[PDB]
Amino acid sequence: MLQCYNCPNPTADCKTAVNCSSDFDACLITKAGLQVYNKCWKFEHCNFNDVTTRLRENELTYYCCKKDLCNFNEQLENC
């Protein structure tokens, strides 16, 4: 099992850490304008088309990682 930040809704500063279902093999962080998402995710869905369609977001950037709690907001907050 992988631990990821997983907030049910987009929010600033997602601190909600969870032990993801074993089927989730990656952690996702995505910024879609004002909406920032942090989820338990899958690599098969770590592509622009799958992230946009599934979060129903027209434009965004995303990042997937495989270490516990890796999907925090460092990349956004350091900029």
From Swiss-Prot:
GO terms for biological process: blood coagulation; cell surface receptor signaling pathway; negative regulation of activation of membrane attack complex; regulation of complement activation; regulation of complement-dependent cytotoxicity. Changing residue 13 to R: No loss of function. Transmembrane segments: none annotated. The keyword Lipoprotein applies. It is a lipid-anchor; GPI-anchor. N- and O-glycosylated. The N-glycosylation mainly consists of a family of biantennary complex-type structures with and without lactosamine extensions and outer arm fucose residues. Also significant amounts of triantennary complexes (22%). Variable sialylation also present in the Asn-19 oligosaccharide. The predominant O-glycans are mono-sialylated forms of the disaccharide, Gal-beta-1,3GalNAc, and their sites of attachment are probably on Thr-52 and Thr-53. Residues 2-78 form the UPAR/Ly6 domain. It is found in: Cell membrane; Secreted. Glycans are attached at residues 19, 42, 52-53. One of its GO terms (molecular function) is complement binding. Changing residue 42 to Q: Loss of glycation mediated inactivation. Its main location: membrane. Changing residue 9 to R/Q: No loss of function. Disulfide bonds join 4-27, 7-14, 20-40, 46-64, 65-70. It is linked to Hemolytic anemia, CD59-mediated, with or without polyneuropathy: An autosomal recessive disorder characterized by infantile onset of chronic hemolysis and a relapsing-remitting polyneuropathy, often exacerbated by infection, and manifested as hypotonia, limb muscle weakness, and hyporeflexia. This is CD59 glycoprotein.
